[model samples]
Target: EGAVIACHTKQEFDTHMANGKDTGKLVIIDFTASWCGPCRVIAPVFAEYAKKFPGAIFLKVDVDELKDVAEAYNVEAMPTFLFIKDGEKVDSVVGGRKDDIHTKIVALMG
Candidate 1:
């Protein structure tokens, strides 16, 4: 049941948020871009986290692909990870640092 889902549109992102609100699980969104080197480096690591942490919803959004969604989240940087719950952003990790991302996920999941 653990997998990373890509949100290429505003509707998809909204549906995920709605579903997450219903499930009462943390929604982790990776706001990335194809041209971003750091995003590429952490892509595999984010997938691994998805598998490791089935308790949360993992979503990927390419800034260029879903400009509105990215703008909604105010994502200005590539590889920005948004931690949300109850349809609200509760935390964020603004970088591609694996350890920091892992720590934040663990903290939020707990």
Candidate 2:
């Protein structure tokens, strides 16, 4: 279960997030875009964290593909990280900081 699920469609993303609501684990999203240089660099770190923390759900979204979703989550310029637990958002990080992301994973697993 420790893996990154790259979401390419609206239905697929909803399926994962909906399923995640029932799992009682941290559901973390990596909201990305094609031209975000910072995200490009830190993208692999997000993947690595998925392997490292099987207790969490790691998901990815392309802002361009899911503009409405990004808007719902109040994301614009990112590499935004959304932390969801039990269907509700708990926190968010708007940049790609590898170390900070790790800290959030460990901290929000509650």
Candidate 3:
């Protein structure tokens, strides 16, 4: 069940977000852009945690792919990690750090 879901549209993200809310599981969204170098660097790390922390749902959102949702969330920076639990935005990380991302995932799951 551990898999990184790449959401290509607002509807796709909507579905996953609702799923996360319904199950009361944490939804960790990576707000990234194709041109972002930092986003590329942490991409693999994000995937790794999808397997490492099977308890949570990992989502990859290309800011340009869903700019409306990005604007809705006010995600101004590339590689922003948004944490959602029980359907609400709880915490976020602005940049890339494998350890920090892992730590946040563990804390949120708890």
Would you estimate the TM-scores of all the predictions? Answer: 0.96, 0.95, 0.97
Name the lDDT of candidate 1: 0.92
The Cα error of candidate 3 at residue 77, in Å, is 1.3
Query: Which runs of model 3 end up more than 4 angstroms from their true locations?
Result: none
Error at 60, model 1, angstroms:
0.2
- Report the lDDT tens digits of candidate 2 across residue range 35-83: 8899898898999999999878999999999888889998977899999
lDDT of 3 at 53: 85
Cα lDDT tens digits, model 3, 1-110, are 78999999899999999999999999999999899999999998899899998889999999999989999999988899999998889999999978888899999888
lDDT of each: 0.92, 0.90, 0.93
- The runs of at least 3 residues in candidate 2 whose Cα sits more than 4 Å from the true structure, single-residue gaps closed, are none
Residue 99 displacement (Å), model 2: 1.3
Quote the RMSD, in angstroms, for model 3. Answer: 0.7
What are the candidates' C-alpha RMSDs? Answer: 0.8, 0.9, 0.7
